[PDB]
Design a protein around this nucleic acid. Structure first.
Ligand SMILES: [Mg+2]
Ligand SMILES: [Mg+2]
Ligand SMILES: [Mg+2]
Ligand SMILES: [Mg+2]
Ligand SMILES: [Mg+2]
Ligand SMILES: [Mg+2]
Ligand SMILES: [Mg+2]
Ligand SMILES: [Mg+2]
Ligand SMILES: [Mg+2]
Ligand SMILES: [Mg+2]
Ligand SMILES: [Mg+2]
Ligand SMILES: [Mg+2]
Ligand SMILES: [Mg+2]
Ligand SMILES: [Mg+2]
Ligand SMILES: [Mg+2]
Ligand SMILES: [Mg+2]
Ligand SMILES: [Mg+2]
Lengths: 127, 63, 226, 25, 97
RNA sequence: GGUGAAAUUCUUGGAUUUAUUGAAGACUAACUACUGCGAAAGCAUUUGCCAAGGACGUUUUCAUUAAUCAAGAACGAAAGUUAGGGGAUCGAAGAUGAUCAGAUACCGUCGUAGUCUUAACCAUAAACUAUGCCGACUAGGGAUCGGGUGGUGUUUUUUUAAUGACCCACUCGGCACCUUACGAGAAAUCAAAGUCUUUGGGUUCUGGGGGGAGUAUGGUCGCAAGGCUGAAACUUAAAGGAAUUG
RNA sequence: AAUCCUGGAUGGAACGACCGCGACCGUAAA
RNA sequence: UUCCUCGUGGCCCAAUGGUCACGGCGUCUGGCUCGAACCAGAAGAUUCCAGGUUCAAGUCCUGGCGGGGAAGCCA
RNA sequence: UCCGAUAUAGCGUAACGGCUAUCACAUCACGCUUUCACCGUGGAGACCGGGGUUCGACUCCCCGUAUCGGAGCCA
């Protein structure tokens, strides 16, 4: 009954991506970011920006014919934060409220097995 | 240009650098059973009524 | 951010969803449900042949979505497209994996983690790397709080697990293996083989990945899809 | 001054004196 | 003088402990001296779970959790309203609240 | 993209992002603990090989072969040097974008040497337990790592056995920890920093107010960087330790 | 008699110790 | 000696022939706080000298002065 | 000489024949901060020059000036 996509939220600090794909990931629909909905470079990571992005994405989804979506929430990962930014949960609640259906949230942040090397020096980012 | 009525049911506490802002837990009159948290500027009570120009947003709670 | 682009183009509208058609994904016969979902491609022009862009696709799907039960809820399955016959493209097993939530919930401290891997091949000339995991268990009547193993127990457990996996994959072709994995009988065999070494809770296996496929052999594929 | 940097200064001085003496040696 | 008998850390009988990096400032700190915390959190919120359950197919589901082990340096932990500072006597308190 | 905010930077020649692969080199997450091994430095993926070691057990053997040790020797983090390889990441230098009164600093983006490895050098560190090694005695308490003993103990096997894993009691040897001070200490604190004016168990090293000074000079080692050894003139009444109230 | 549940923070800048006289020099605090 | 160039508020520098002349630093006044930094504001010019060209010359033309630079070669 | 492009507020830049024309910077104020920077809201400001086509020219046609790039060159 339901036609499923994959939302693939990447909630970084400094930005948030919401962009839905087909079940395979090769075919993408409706990539929207927080910096497409605001004019600061300061609020690109804001929950409001993420919410508006998710709203536009859900609009395009129902324009195409997608009704449900699986969620893969992601942070920067690698050597970087590994914890998600503020605009992930907001986007999720937004595209839940908009009319889409949800199924099988997963957290897919790339985690290393003792990675190469973090940046900042051994003495840290100093401020 | 739609707006939303919301009834206050619980005052949480003051907020802001200088104490001129208050947190409130409002319950929507229409679309009831929805309870969002909002910032408020002026003197506010429970059973007061606010007109949200934007309803799909929550304020960072302090607790 | 919207108006911050100083130059959009280094030197100096058409909707693409009118150009696309849908395609239904069919799973093999070692799965209670066949209709996995739908996929998109562009209309097959005379020079692209959308089936070719669609052939080597991989789709990740929950084994709960394939079987009905929510006990197979973590247990992702990667299915690889192999053939197209009129809008019902057919898939085969490409790999298994766990969810990060399950792995992390399993991984607790004050218990010993045990990992094993084998790189065995099957009768159908598939080459698979199977990963097994286990965690030590704190017995009932136990008062000391950590329950670690003694690093020879770990090695013996790992030997047992590796030989069991090489024994159980040899003989299973690929679909026989999938039907062995879904009911989680490998875990029961590992538990019965290790209970004389160490308790070993949470003997869920781990991801499976394909390294080397044989040539296509459409017949064995269509033997699945009835 | 920090002893590490006093030491570094003294070392650079010892080096310059080594070479100004190699001039004559 | 000496402040702590462990001196800052948990290195009795090792010599060297193979540093880790702080999650905020990327400072190299020995793993024993680091502060380890474990931030386990439901993925969405306690607030949006109602909307998610209402808009969800597959009832009963789970709403799984997120797990990451946080390593902070001393400076960052003291700045972030963690192990803040204690009296000479309560410094010896080795338990949590 | 980055930031507190930005800009440098990349972007309709499609950047960021998605999927599927491939290559390279590094690293060995989570498990990871007041836990382990090692003379220390140090050592965390699997498997195999090579040799080594401690503890325990022992109604085995030798029989004082021992302890500490000037001279002398092996090992010795990181950086650095020579030569090859390798060269992803990060990144002394350097270039840049900011901030700033200035900022050739902190922040950001790039980025050589280096970071890895082979064969040699160097021989330094808050190389710290800032506590030399050996030995005996002196207070309680519990936990833990390894070994061993005992228990009709629990569980699993094949109800059963032997095991293995747990529980109880005990013990040797470790990493440590809690409480107290008989005692010690200037105190902070210490089961050793105690058994020291009621002053002697054995033994090696080092210091004698602060600076000048780990400087100058001479030797010696080193490719070099530098290391080891190491004064004097002159100057000075205080430097310094631990605690106390502000 | 019904009844499934939750806790959570970022953040710019912020130097110094004090005076006067055309000449060297002169004056000042606890 | 020849040739080229420049001459501008106390300092550095700029200008369409077209307002008794842009900027920055310095100075002065007030403010913030004692001084710097910072916020506001003011003042200061016969554009090197002597001549001419145009309705108008800082500028357009000639000579002098001073500062700098290039050339001064074959023997 | 040929081809192509460009000239737009103080600078730069964008545009459909149904607008004396949007934009970030410059400046005029109002705001916000202990102040400084950062930041937000309203303004006032311009289609290279001249002819032609058109219910309507920045825009199209012709000519000319200036600039850039590439090609060419018998007084
Ligand atoms: Mg101190
Ligand atoms: Mg060390
Ligand atoms: Mg792309
Ligand atoms: Mg590991
Ligand atoms: Mg161990
Ligand atoms: Mg030394
Ligand atoms: Mg020492
Ligand atoms: Mg002793
Ligand atoms: Mg024992
Ligand atoms: Mg013991
Ligand atoms: Mg030990
Ligand atoms: Mg003396
Ligand atoms: Mg002395
Ligand atoms: Mg003191
Ligand atoms: Mg001064
Ligand atoms: Mg001074
Ligand atoms: Mg003034």
């Amino acid at each position: 009954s339901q036609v499923f996509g994959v939302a693939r939220i990447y909630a970084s600090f400094n930005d948030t991506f919401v962009h839905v794909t087909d079940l395979s990931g090769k075919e993408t629909i409706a990539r929207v970011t927080g910096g497409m909905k605001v004019k600061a470079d300061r609020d690109e990571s804001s929950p409001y920006a993420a919410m508006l992005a998710a709203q536009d994405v859900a609009a395009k989804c129902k324009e195409v014919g997608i009704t449900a979506v699986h969620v893969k929430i992601r942070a920067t990962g690698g050597t970087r934060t590994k914890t998600p930014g503020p605009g992930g949960q907001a986007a999720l609640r937004a595209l839940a409220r908009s009319g889409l259906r949800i199924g099988r949230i997963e957290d897919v942040t790339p985690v290393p097995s003792d990675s190469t090397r973090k940046k900042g020096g051994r003495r840290g980012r100093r401020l | 240009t739609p707006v939303t009525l919301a009834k206050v049911i619980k005052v949480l506490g003051r907020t802001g650098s200088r104490g001129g802002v208050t947190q409130v837990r409002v319950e929507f009159l229409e679309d009831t059973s929805r309870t969002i948290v909002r910032n408020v500027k002026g003197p506010v009570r429970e059973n007061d009524i606010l007109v949200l120009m934007e309803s799909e947003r929550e304020a960072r709670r302090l607790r | 951010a919207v108006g911050k682009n100083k130059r959009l183009s280094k030197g100096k509208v058409v909707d693409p969803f009118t150009r696309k058609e849908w395609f239904d994904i069919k799973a093999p016969s070692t799965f209670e449900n066949r209709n996995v979902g739908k996929t998109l491609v562009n209309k097959s022009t005379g020079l692209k042949s959308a089936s070719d862009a669609l052939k080597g696709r991989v789709v990740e799907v929950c084994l709960a979505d394939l079987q009905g039960s929510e006990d197979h809820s973590f247990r992702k399955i990667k299915l690889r497209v192999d053939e197209v016959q009129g809008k019902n493209l057919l898939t085969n097993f490409h790999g298994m994996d766990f969810t990060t939530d399950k792995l992390r919930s399993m991984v607790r401290k004050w218990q010993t983690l045990i990992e094993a891997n084998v790189t065995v091949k099957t009768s159908d000339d598939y080459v698979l790397r199977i990963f097994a995991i286990a965690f030590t268990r704190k017995q009932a009547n136990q008062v000391k709080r950590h329950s670690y193993a003694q690093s020879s127990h770990i090695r013996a457990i790992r030997k047992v697990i590796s030989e069991i996996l090489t024994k159980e994959v040899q003989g299973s072709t690929l679909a026989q293996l999938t039907s062995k994995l879904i009911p989680e009988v490998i875990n029961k065999e590992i538990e019965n083989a290790t209970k004389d070494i160490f308790p070993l809770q949470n003997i869920h296996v781990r991801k499976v990945k394909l390294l080397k496929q044989p040539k296509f052999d459409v017949g064995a594929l269509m033997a699945l899809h009835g | 001054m920090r002893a590490k940097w006093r030491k570094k200064r003294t070392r650079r001085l010892k080096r310059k004196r080594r070479k100004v003496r190699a001039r004559s040696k | 003088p000496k402040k702590r008998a462990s001196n800052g850390r948990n290195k009795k009988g090792r010599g060297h402990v193979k540093p880790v990096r702080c999650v905020n400032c990327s400072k190299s700190i020995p793993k024993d001296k680091a502060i380890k915390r474990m931030a386990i959190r439901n993925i969405v919120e306690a607030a949006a779970v109602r909307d998610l359950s209402e808009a969800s197919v597959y009832p009963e589901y789970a709403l799984p959790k997120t797990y990451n082990k946080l390593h902070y340096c001393v400076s960052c932990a003291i700045h972030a309203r963690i192990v803040r500072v204690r009296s000479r006597e309560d410094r010896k308190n080795r338990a949590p609240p």
